[PDB]
Design an enzyme around this catalytic site. Structure first.
Site, mmCIF file in Angstrom:
data_model
loop_
_atom_site.group_PDB
_atom_site.id
_atom_site.type_symbol
_atom_site.label_atom_id
_atom_site.label_comp_id
_atom_site.label_asym_id
_atom_site.label_seq_id
_atom_site.Cartn_x
_atom_site.Cartn_y
_atom_site.Cartn_z
ATOM 1 N N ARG A 178 -5.908 -10.150 -5.569
ATOM 2 C CA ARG A 178 -7.054 -9.273 -5.368
ATOM 3 C C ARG A 178 -7.424 -8.578 -6.668
ATOM 4 O O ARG A 178 -6.572 -7.966 -7.320
ATOM 5 C CB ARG A 178 -6.784 -8.229 -4.281
ATOM 6 C CG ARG A 178 -8.058 -7.582 -3.758
ATOM 7 C CD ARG A 178 -7.791 -6.633 -2.607
ATOM 8 N NE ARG A 178 -7.107 -5.426 -3.052
ATOM 9 C CZ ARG A 178 -7.341 -4.212 -2.563
ATOM 10 N NH1 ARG A 178 -8.249 -4.044 -1.610
ATOM 11 N NH2 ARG A 178 -6.670 -3.169 -3.029
ATOM 12 N N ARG A 194 -8.869 7.432 -3.932
ATOM 13 C CA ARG A 194 -8.553 6.277 -3.116
ATOM 14 C C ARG A 194 -8.309 6.701 -1.671
ATOM 15 O O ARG A 194 -8.064 7.871 -1.369
ATOM 16 C CB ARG A 194 -7.343 5.545 -3.696
ATOM 17 C CG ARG A 194 -7.375 5.467 -5.221
ATOM 18 C CD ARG A 194 -6.606 4.272 -5.756
ATOM 19 N NE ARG A 194 -6.806 3.063 -4.957
ATOM 20 C CZ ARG A 194 -7.371 1.945 -5.401
ATOM 21 N NH1 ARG A 194 -7.800 1.867 -6.653
ATOM 22 N NH2 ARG A 194 -7.503 0.902 -4.591
ATOM 23 N N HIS A 243 0.839 -1.188 0.000
ATOM 24 C CA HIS A 243 0.000 0.000 0.000
ATOM 25 C C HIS A 243 0.881 1.247 0.000
ATOM 26 O O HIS A 243 1.862 1.312 0.754
ATOM 27 C CB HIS A 243 -0.930 0.005 1.217
ATOM 28 C CG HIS A 243 -2.197 -0.763 1.013
ATOM 29 N ND1 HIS A 243 -2.289 -2.119 1.239
ATOM 30 C CD2 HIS A 243 -3.425 -0.365 0.601
ATOM 31 C CE1 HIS A 243 -3.519 -2.524 0.977
ATOM 32 N NE2 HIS A 243 -4.228 -1.480 0.587
ATOM 33 N N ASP A 266 -11.955 1.925 3.035
ATOM 34 C CA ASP A 266 -13.021 2.450 2.191
ATOM 35 C C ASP A 266 -14.340 2.613 2.939
ATOM 36 O O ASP A 266 -15.170 3.430 2.526
ATOM 37 C CB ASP A 266 -13.188 1.547 0.963
ATOM 38 C CG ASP A 266 -12.110 1.794 -0.077
ATOM 39 O OD1 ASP A 266 -11.387 2.801 0.085
ATOM 40 O OD2 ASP A 266 -11.962 0.979 -1.016
ATOM 41 N N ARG A 311 -6.544 -3.273 7.846
ATOM 42 C CA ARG A 311 -6.236 -2.089 8.634
ATOM 43 C C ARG A 311 -5.032 -1.352 8.063
ATOM 44 O O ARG A 311 -4.092 -1.968 7.553
ATOM 45 C CB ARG A 311 -5.955 -2.465 10.088
ATOM 46 C CG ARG A 311 -7.159 -2.954 10.864
ATOM 47 C CD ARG A 311 -6.846 -2.962 12.350
ATOM 48 N NE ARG A 311 -8.046 -3.035 13.175
ATOM 49 C CZ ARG A 311 -8.508 -4.152 13.725
ATOM 50 N NH1 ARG A 311 -7.870 -5.296 13.533
ATOM 51 N NH2 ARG A 311 -9.606 -4.120 14.467
ATOM 52 N N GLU A 347 -16.096 -3.610 1.449
ATOM 53 C CA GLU A 347 -15.390 -2.356 1.673
ATOM 54 C C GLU A 347 -16.299 -1.169 1.962
ATOM 55 O O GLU A 347 -15.862 -0.227 2.626
ATOM 56 C CB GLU A 347 -14.524 -2.010 0.458
ATOM 57 C CG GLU A 347 -13.087 -2.469 0.555
ATOM 58 C CD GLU A 347 -12.347 -2.314 -0.758
ATOM 59 O OE1 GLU A 347 -12.833 -2.847 -1.777
ATOM 60 O OE2 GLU A 347 -11.277 -1.668 -0.771
#
Ligand SMILES: O=P(O)(O)OC[C@H]1O[C@H](O)[C@H](O)[C@@H](O)[C@@H]1O
Ligand SMILES: O=P(O)(O)OC[C@H]1O[C@H](O)[C@H](O)[C@@H](O)[C@@H]1O
Lengths: 915, 911
Positions: free
Chosen positions: B409, B720, B130, B556, B594, B519
């Site tokens: 994913r 995002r 991320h 999200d 998280r 999400e």
């Protein structure tokens, strides 16, 4: 006293857990009985020990001997940690103290101390002399046991980490106890080399850059606002493993090729790790123009292709990271260097070129020095003095071959080859010629440019090995080799023959030829040999003002006495240095000294101090022999000490030399030496029944069963087994025999000579050091033990001879203590004496154990009373013991050979010396 | 002000020695005025500070922004060392040993119950790339060294020479980080963010797992269990998203997944080789099994007495009286083939070395090691087997042949895109327009059918191709390298069934378990229903075999609703899903997505596990470790030991000693404020059109991509979660974290005055409500409306600042009621040190806040005149030309980026 009781507590617990309480109590009972012998002098306690140790079951006997061996080893480890801890506390001999004392007290300037260091070089030569009685499996455990023991005594750790560190300590002691201590197969010269090289990996590699950084810290603290130039090799490292073939036919030309390639691959491997770490560190962008053009040349010349199996820097490196661009090219050339060595080792060819790899040390240093200069010119000198400065010093110290390999062969092996050439041609017999005739012919041949070696020359297996070695020397790069040492060198024709056999065998860049003067006569004619060499125009054109000469502390002490050999080596060093200075040559002496006092051993700063003044001058080589490699480099702590000792003592001996002997001192030494050697040789050489007694009173004939080395009357015996036999009995005959006669002769010549003997001991460092070591040996001595061996194994007709030798022991010790100012052995040094009182009962047990086992081996019908089994594991006779059957088909009855070998390893452990 | 003053005093000295004394005290004068803003509130001083930041030369503006960035970084390093030293003293946040003792003595469970619980526990920590790591890897490497030198410089027994040499090394590496380009000039590849994550697996996690399992065993001993934890118990696993998660990232291609899978298998082989040849030297015993004896004689006989001249150790044949060395020598050669075969597949696509020559399964690898272990034990040498051999056995069960298992994913709509293309091309109809009940019946008829579906004639976009190509790569690579297939923004059971079919019709011979990621708020509300529908169809129950995993997104959902309403529906989602699973006899594993920031669900690990509803973990849980958090939790060894212990102890205590469930009154009130909080949230972010123009004006959101953090290259729902939180974190306003909480709290108080004591009762007793509000006050501690008001006065239009001040006052309002619910006098009362870590950092953070707003002003406003002043650095423009073709004039982009990294460093968070 607390580290020792700790580890011994852990061991006895592991012993009780695995074999039961009976075997634990027995071992402790042996200590109490022996402790009464050592504490009281009760010679009947030795008979009590003999009673217990006889009759044991075969497995129990091995376990008893192995337990004491491990506990003596643990006692050693406990002391090595204790002295390290005390040395640390003493800082809350040193290289900074030596630099301060050299500026403040002796009055030298900081700049001339700086200039002295920049010209100093101490080459430490690793050799595989068969003195390491512990197999590498067990030594490896010793590192972890000491590591656990050190971390366990930090005042920082939690109760839980303390609990896990001891569990790890108990399991490491157990891992050693359950390993076969006995090396069941003879090692390979490649195995011996790997044992030596392991210390280059684990300690020396990162050791010397850490030490060179301390040298700069000491220079800064005496006013020198400048680092020691990185091209200064304060310490270099050489190797005999794979190169020395004196009396070792298993060291073949193939073996030498192997260790040279394997070392070059190891060096590339360590360099790879250092360069990859450096690639990640030097992420700066400011750089010199010379690197900016080089980083753009490399970024352009190499296509922007990726390497997906690289773990870091797998894409093309951007040119705004110039140090990574330059080092990525070094990393790529290093990978080729590693595997080109890998390929040559497996099958002597490689797809990888020599142009794609690093072939010279200038080739390797060129990009590294470009980075250093680049960083400095942008004000980033602080960054360049980091990992990059460390690496730059590593390259100057270790080069592309990690260590340089000396070659050694004996003189009569070359004479055998040259006689073959002259006999095969029409010349005649080189062997029959006089020494001057040989020097005349060799010089006419070295001066002549016509080849000599005929292709169809008939060769023995020995002559083929000598020539094949020289062929191997011509194939491999010259930077992999040190000098070619002549064992048993006597006269200049020995040096000139090798100089010719070198060129007549295609060595395009010949190695320097170093004579090894090992015997007394050879050392007496050593300055004469050096002089006539120096007076030949061809030889002076070849050596170019640089000469190296080796002196052998082992075979010279074996030829004459300890006192005589020690003195003659002082003179040989002194007169050779005078010859070299007259002829404008820089002489570098090569000291071949072992671990034991009898083979030239002793504290480093003390051995350097006993060497004649103005014969070192910042250029000395010393052999680190076998077990001494562990003693000096077994852990980072020790390597730093060893490097600091040699550097400091070599620097002090240069600017602040010891005193030269007074003329009366020399005359006394010269006459005492003659009496010493005559007394020594009257016992060793002349006495007819000496060797019969010597083989009865000692375990000499069993030394080879320990399988330490690769080597497959008294004249034929090697020096290491010689010293070994008399260290096992704690008699140390060769180390003092003759000193008693020389001291008496001196005082019965004149009673006042007792006063000059005391003046020499108090004023002459060579004399004090020589006799101080003799005291340290008598500390490790016990005539009662020699008497016990005499009683059990020596024939009755030879017992008066043995008592005569014990009498010379007692009178030599009486003297030496009276010439010194001491009441008894080891007054002004109680720590070492404390280490003796704790180790001695377990050595005495093994002494009684060894003697009675030798009696059971030589007398197969010596009656004993069988005892009940002690170990719960091998207590029920259903099926034989695995421990006993670890030696299938032994020349001796079951358990005896293994028991004997363990006592030899255990006594060597307790004595802290093998030979 | 100990390590802190130390670390900067050297940096300030290094700065002056290279750039002159004037630049040194300019940055100290910047601390001057900002420290007095923090020690007063004088908005006058920020304009004063901005006055001289503006006129700096382009090269000086870069140096000043970088200097503040390195000092804030040094202040964090000093804080990290101080914390580690304080934790060390506190043992001379629960220990794993204390937790075991408390569970046995206080709670009253038997030691065997605790033992049996530990044997069934597994905490899977998922490393993801991320885009939160603001620092370059070159800078992170030097940060570890600086912490190392600073630690050794304070030991109790080092000499004066050792001290002054460690000092020179500390300075030369403070200087090596300063003279490095802090800006990542090129966007990284997915295969690079895999490198970054796997670096921690090498440097701390590899050896840290067996070290921690060692402490778990001593803890078991000190509560009466005279047995080691079985080595096949995987107390902690490690998974990865790097090269596997491709949602929103078209650069994560099917080739990229293939790379990281084989590269990890190679890294695994490298580490095992080192452990094996190390174990080769160690296991020198001669006593062995009957089974090991026969084995060692079998291989000694079948192996010819060849030598390997390039082997450093054990280059000749091994004697059969060293049995453990014989077996481990064969293991070693089989590992060398495994490493090289992975190297060949990675470079080309084929290898000369067979699969029969290498290790292709964990079972093939474990058989020789377990034989040695049982052998040593049968000879009474169990204490030896529990040394390096036990550590390696535990490493095999923890890491396997792939080191980490990869998760895949992709978002649900990308799957529906492909299936719609299938039905359209076949003429079945349009899958996209079918109702969900129809979708379920169609895919269930195709999964039950035996006829293929996917035609090779299928017209494909680039996206529809990426979806199928990714499934193709899954079929090629070994199953033990993958975890589950995760569906982003999952809404309904057809999204799960769509992936199940696509897997089989793409030839995946052993399909990955399909995991829905709920999400958004609406998806979590229907999530217990979607799970019940899946658990009620016979085909899917036969497939999953009593085990189901569901991911819940914290990033999200907090963006869809407020922070209050997201956290409460996330509580209810987990709660009701576990009830559905228990009814159908399914073991449900929750995957918690998280982040680092509180807005994305971040917070102390043991606090987060305490917030989760009772009876929802039960020894099975997965948690993401996202980006910069990987450094936070595994950057050094003591951090790795700390992280593994928190997860293990918290999860274990949660199972046998759960938190209290909320009271019925507490539920109803929570439900009612969730409605009020979301309505307050959506009213300002969704409703009102000018919010976007205000957002892009008052925050630096539009330049977050210029840091080149990740490989990810319209409207407001298009943004995002990470840039969303990042934007309000840099302005120290933190709008998303606290928005709806203010309206929620007052609504409860005004509806009934007695709810004020009920809010207090929930804060004192309910762990979920207490942790949620406690995290809010920590955010307010790092908040400051004055800075948010700054950015407005320079950058936002006049029509919008009335709106900006309205938000500024709901900040102050919510902060008021939050403190009143907590019953605290001021922010961070009983946490004194980490509030004094703010008083030291915030002056520097405030200077960069003024630097950002003013730099943004001169970028968007090309008209704004500024007077250039003489240069400060004695070096000067080589530093400027590190950015060749910048969209902005000279120096402003680099200064703007250095700003962003600096505040991220000072705030100790990015997004
Ligand atoms: O550029 P940094 O973030 O400092 O990372 C340093 C290096 O890390 C890895 O090796 C990447 O593969 C490289 O491309 C990168 O240059
Ligand atoms: O047998 P040791 O002395 O314990 O040495 C351990 C090992 O060292 C090297 O690796 C040798 O190549 C082996 O043959 C030897 O077994």
């Amino acid at each position: 006293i607390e580290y020792d009781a700790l580890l011994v507590d852990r061991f006895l617990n592991i012993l009780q857990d695995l074999h039961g309480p009976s075997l634990r109590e027995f071992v402790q009972e042996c200590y109490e009985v022996s402790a009464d012998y050592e504490g009281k002098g009760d010679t009947t306690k030795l008979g009590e020990l003999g009673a217990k140790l006889t009759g044991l079951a075969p497995a129990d006997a091995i376990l008893v001997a192995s337990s004491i061996l491990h506990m003596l080893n643990l006692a050693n480890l406990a002391e090595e940690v204790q002295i390290a801890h005390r040395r640390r506390n003493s800082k809350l001999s040193d290289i900074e103290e030596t630099l301060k004392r050299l500026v403040s007290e002796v009055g030298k300037s900081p700049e001339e101390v700086f200039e002295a260091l920049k010209n100093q070089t101490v080459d430490l030569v690793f050799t595989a002399h068969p003195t390491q009685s512990a197999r590498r499996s067990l030594l490896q455990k010793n590192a972890r046991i000491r590591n656990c023991l050190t971390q366990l005594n930090a005042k920082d750790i939690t109760d839980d980490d303390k609990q896990e560190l001891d569990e790890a300590l108990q399991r490491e002691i157990q891992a050693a106890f359950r390993t076969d201590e006995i090396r069941r197969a003879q090692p390979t010269p490649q195995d011996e080399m790997r044992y030596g090289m392991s210390y280059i990996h684990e300690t020396v590699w990162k050791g010397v850059p850490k030490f060179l950084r301390r040298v700069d810290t000491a220079l800064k603290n005496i006013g020198i606002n400048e680092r020691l130039p990185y091209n200064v090799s304060l310490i270099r490292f050489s190797s005999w493993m794979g190169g020395d073939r004196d009396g070792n036919p298993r060291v073949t030309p193939e073996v030498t090729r192997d260790v040279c390639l394997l070392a070059r691959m190891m060096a590339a491997n360590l360099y790879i790790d250092q360069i990859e770490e450096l690639m990640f560190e030097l992420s700066m962008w400011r750089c010199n123009d010379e690197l900016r053009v080089r980083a753009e040349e490399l970024h352009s010349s190499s296509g922007s292709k990726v390497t997906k199996y690289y773990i870091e820097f797998w894409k093309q490196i951007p040119p705004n990271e110039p140090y990574r661009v330059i080092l990525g090219h070094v990393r790529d050339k290093l990978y080729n260097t590693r595997e080109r060595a890998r390929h040559l080792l497996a099958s002597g060819v490689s797809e990888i070129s020599a142009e794609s790899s690093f072939t010279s040390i200038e080739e390797f240093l060129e990009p590294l020095e470009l980075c250093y200069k680049s960083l400095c010119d942008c004000g980033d000198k602080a960054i360049a003095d980091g990992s990059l400065l460390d690496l730059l010093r590593q390259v100057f110290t270790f080069g592309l071959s990690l260590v340089k390999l000396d070659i050694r062969q004996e003189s009569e092996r070359h004479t055998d080859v040259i006689d073959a050439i002259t006999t095969h041609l029409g010349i005649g017999s080189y062997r029959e010629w006089s020494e001057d005739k040989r020097q005349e012919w060799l010089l006419s041949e070295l001066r002549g440019k016509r080849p000599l070696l005929p292709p169809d020359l008939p060769q023995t297996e020995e002559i083929a090995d000598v020539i094949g070695a020289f062929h191997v020397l011509a194939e491999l790069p010259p930077d992999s080799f040190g000098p070619y040492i002549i064992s048993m060198a006597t006269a200049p024709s020995d040096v000139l023959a090798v100089e010719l056999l070198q060129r007549e065998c295609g060595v395009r860049q010949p190695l320097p030829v170093v004579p090894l003067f090992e015997r007394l006569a050879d050392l007496q004619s050593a300055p004469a040999s050096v002089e006539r060499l120096f007076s030949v125009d061809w030889y002076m054109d070849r050596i170019k003002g640089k000469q190296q000469v080796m002196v052998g502390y082992s075979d010279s002490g074996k030829d004459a006495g300890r006192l005589s050999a020690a003195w003659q080596l002082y003179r040989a060093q002194e007169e050779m240095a005078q010859v070299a200075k007259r002829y404008g040559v820089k002489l570098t002496l090569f000291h071949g000294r072992g671990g034991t006092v009898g083979r030239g051993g002793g504290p480093t700063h003390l051995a350097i101090l006993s060497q004649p003044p103005d014969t070192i001058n910042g250029s000395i080589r010393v052999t680190v022999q076998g077990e001494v490699i562990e003693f000096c480099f077994g852990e980072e702590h020790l390597c730093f000490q060893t490097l600091q000792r040699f550097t400091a003592a070599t620097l002090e001996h240069g600017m602040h030399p010891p005193v030269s002997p007074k003329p009366e001192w020399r005359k006394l030494m010269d006459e005492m030496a003659v009496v010493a050697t005559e007394e020594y040789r009257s016992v060793v050489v002349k006495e007819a029944r000496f060797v019969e007694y010597f083989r009865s009173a000692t375990p000499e004939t069993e030394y080879g069963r320990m399988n330490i080395g690769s080597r497959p009357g008294i004249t034929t015996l090697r020096a290491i087994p010689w010293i070994f036999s008399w260290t096992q009995t704690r008699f140390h005959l060769p180390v003092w025999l003759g000193v008693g006669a020389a001291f008496k002769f001196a005082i019965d010549k004149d009673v006042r000579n007792f006063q000059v003997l005391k003046e020499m001991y108090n004023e002459w460092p060579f004399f004090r050091v020589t006799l101080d070591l003799l005291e340290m040996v008598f500390a490790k001595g016990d005539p009662g033990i020699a008497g016990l061996y005499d009683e059990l194994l020596v024939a009755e007709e030879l017992k008066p001879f043995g008592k005569q030798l014990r009498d010379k022991y007692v009178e030599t010790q009486q003297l030496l203590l009276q010439i010194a100012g001491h009441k008894d052995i080891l007054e002004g040094d109680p720590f070492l004496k404390q280490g003796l009182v704790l180790r001695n009962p377990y050595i005495t047990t093994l002494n009684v154990f060894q003697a009675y086992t030798l009696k059971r081996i030589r007398d197969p019908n010596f009656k004993v009373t069988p005892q009940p089994p002690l170990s719960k594991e091998f207590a029920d006779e259903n099926k034989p013991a695995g421990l006993v059957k670890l030696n299938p088909a032994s020349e001796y009855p079951p358990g005896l050979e293994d028991t004997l070998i363990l006592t030899m390893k255990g006594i060597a452990a307790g004595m802290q010396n093998t030979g």
